[PDB]
């Protein structure tokens, strides 16, 4: 029922160390603010507001950091391990779980205090502050497959053909089959309905000597951005990551990685800002995505 916080040293990595900061020996209490600020750069011209660009600011999170070691040695060890575990990574991930959500925030330590004003057994009562990187996200795993419909064959496919008003037949073992599906293509597409932070994907090119990647279309079906490549050699798969802090465009051939950025269609890559609409594959048999979904407030 009650809310749960956890600090992950590497969310979704095999080496992930999890500190239960709700029930463990190191706990977080009283987040300063899990809210936000907004500006619309409004100018009043005698009370009449003139709206400008809207911008969100995520405030830093300060927590009360308390230790529950049963001795001086244990409490010194808990402080040292917790802080150095945070300090050893580029960023750390806070898990925020309630009965209605299980969300994450990528954070970077801004400050930590260390004093001597000990309670029983030398327990710590300090302040920890984090700079926000990505506040409130979840991961969504999506697979896109380029499936082609079969052909329509008179005598096999379900269709009312022939002499008027048309017919099909049940013929043991050949009877009627379904040619395909209307919009089979939908299975290779991302139907974008929500805000995202970024995405990461593994692209499997189809035809050789042909550019491959993905394109993004707005609500009226017009292309507004795309990540497309033209490599000299065929790649087993291409890995992409639009995360501003871990941005990657690399082709893999066997166990060899190559930076494919110099070979991207820069003119087509207009923006990284993904709008509502849909993503289509470009010369790919399959694509596997890990999308970083976004929520400014939870």
């Amino acid at each position: 029922g009650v809310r749960q916080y956890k600090i992950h040293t590497n969310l979704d990595g095999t080496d992930d160390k999890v500190w239960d900061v709700t029930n463990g020996k190191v706990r977080f209490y009283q987040p300063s603010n899990l809210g936000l600020q907004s500006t619309n750069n409004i100018w009043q011209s005698n009370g009449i507001g003139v709206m400008g660009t809207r911008s969100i600011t995520q405030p830093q999170i300060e927590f009360k950091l308390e230790t529950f070691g049963e001795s001086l040695e244990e409490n010194y060890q808990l402080m040292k391990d917790f802080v150095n575990d945070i300090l050893s990574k580029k960023f750390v991930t806070l898990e925020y779980q309630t009965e209605i959500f299980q969300v994450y925030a990528d954070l970077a330590l801004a400050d930590v205090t260390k004093t001597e004003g000990y309670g029983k057994n030398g327990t710590f009562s300090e302040k920890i502050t984090f700079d926000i990187i990505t506040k409130w996200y979840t991961y969504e795993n999506l697979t896109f497959d380029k499936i082609q419909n079969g052909k329509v064959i008179a005598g096999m496919s379900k269709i009312y053909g022939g002499t008027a008003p048309g017919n099909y037949k049940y013929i043991k073992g050949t009877s009627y089959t379904y040619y395909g599906e209307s919009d089979i293509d939908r299975l290779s597409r991302w139907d974008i309905k929500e805000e995202i932070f970024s995405f990461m994907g593994i692209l499997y090119p189809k035809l050789p000597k042909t550019p491959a990647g993905v394109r993004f279309l707005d609500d009226i079906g017009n292309e507004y951005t795309a990540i497309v490549f033209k490599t000299e050699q065929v790649q087993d798969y291409i890995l992409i990551n639009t995360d501003v802090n871990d941005e990657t465009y690399q082709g893999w051939k066997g166990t060899t990685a190559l930076n494919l950025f110099p070979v991207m269609d820069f003119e087509r890559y207009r923006t990284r800002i993904i709008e509502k609409g849909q993503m289509e594959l470009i010369n790919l048999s399959k694509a596997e995505f890990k999308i970083k979904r976004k929520a400014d407030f939870v």
């Binding site: 501003v244 941005e247 950025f261 003119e267 890559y269 990284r272």
Partner: protein, 375 residues
């Protein structure tokens, strides 16, 4: 914190003496000494070439006005200094100390710009090739600072030189700025030991070098995440012109008493007398950037050749400069010729400078255009 080699002024009065006995016995100019100190550099803003701004740093040893400060970076830069020869050159930034405040905060001027201080260039020096200007400019027999040679591909400076504003005597500072904008290279200062085992000297060279001996334009993309600063040159700063107003001295009056003739640079690079234009305007630049030119007639009363006028102007617009953080996906270096896609627009130009702070590494891209002629 950076490492720096501090030296006494590289005074040409002292070093420009050919009394040094080389290993073969033959006499050469005195080489430079070892640093007088090795110190560290903190709270700094260091520009590679000094294209736009002066540099500053607090040094750990007290320096004085006139000292030479070579600041070292634990990084390399790709340079191809001859048709076949590619090297990974150590990144250094060489300055003259121009001011030192009470706290040991030094103001640093890039060696090349300090070297050519107070030298003037009469218009007559602009009569032939750009190389003729470069060779006049870089000379230990005239300069305030010592130098042992200049390096570059001949082709860059083999073209016709542009004239001075108002056909007057200009400062070497202004003519160098003009030429460098035209050729799309900024100079770098280098300190090295003579590569041959025959020469033991520690030398200083001026360079007009890049990653490729014959530059190959790089097409890339700069992103909003790279803390991009976008500005346009002020009219005082204007370094590119696409249109010319040409005055020719009348022989009888010995003055510019005849009307000017106007010349335009089309998008493809062609320059014509503007009065002869018969197109629809879609083949001309989308803004006009005019400059006034003044010439004398030759001994036969001939006005300048179109080929002389042609070099003053190019297919280019209002020059936008983009300052952005270095990107590991495709690193750029000083003197790279580039095509940058930024916020859905294409910008053609080159990397004029680079800045190093404790927290940043940024490039200055100058939208010089002149895509059809620049090499």
């Amino acid at each position: 914190m950076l490492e720096a080699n501090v030296y006494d002024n590289f005074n040409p009065n002292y070093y420009n003496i050919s009394d040094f006995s080389m290993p073969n016995g033959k006499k050469e100019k005195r080489g430079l000494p070892i640093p007088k100190a090795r110190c560290q550099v903190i709270n700094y803003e260091l520009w590679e070439t000094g294209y736009l701004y002066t540099s500053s740093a607090t040094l750990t040893v007290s320096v004085e006005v006139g000292d030479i400060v070579q600041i070292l970076f634990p990084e390399v830069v790709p340079i191809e200094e001859a048709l076949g020869k590619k090297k990974k050159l150590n990144l250094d930034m060489v300055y003259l100390v121009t001011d030192v405040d009470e706290s040991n905060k030094a103001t640093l001027k890039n060696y090349f710009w300090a070297m050519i201080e107070s030298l003037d260039v009469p218009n007559a020096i602009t009569k032939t090739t750009n190389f003729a200007i470069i060779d006049y400019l870089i000379d230990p027999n005239k300069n305030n600072l010592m130098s042992y040679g200049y390096f570059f591909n001949s082709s860059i400076f083999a073209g016709k030189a542009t004239i001075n504003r108002k056909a007057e005597t200009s400062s070497a500072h202004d003519v160098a700025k003009r030429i460098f904008s035209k050729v799309q290279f900024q100079p770098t200062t280098t300190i090295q030991h003579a590569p041959s085992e025959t020469d033991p000297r520690n030398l200083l060279f001026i360079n007009f070098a890049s990653r490729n001996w014959n530059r190959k334009r790089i097409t890339t993309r700069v992103d909003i995440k790279q803390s991009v600063t976008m500005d346009t040159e002020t009219i005082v700063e204007r370094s590119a012109y696409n249109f010319a107003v040409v005055f020719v001295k009348n022989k009888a009056t010995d003055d510019y008493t005849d009307p000017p003739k106007m010349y335009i640079a089309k998008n493809n690079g062609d320059v014509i007398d503007y009065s002869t234009y018969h197109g629809d305007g879609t083949d001309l630049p989308d803004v006009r950037t005019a400059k006034t030119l003044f010439y004398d007639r030759d001994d036969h009363g001939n006005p300048p050749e179109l080929s002389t006028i042609k070099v003053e102007i190019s297919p280019s617009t209002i020059v936008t400069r983009l300052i952005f953080n270095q990107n590991e996906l495709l690193p750029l270096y000083v003197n790279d010729l580039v095509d940058i896609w930024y916020e859905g627009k294409l910008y053609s130009g080159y990397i004029a400078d680079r800045v190093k702070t404790e927290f940043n590494d940024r490039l200055i891209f100058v939208e010089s255009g002149d895509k059809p002629n620049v090499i």
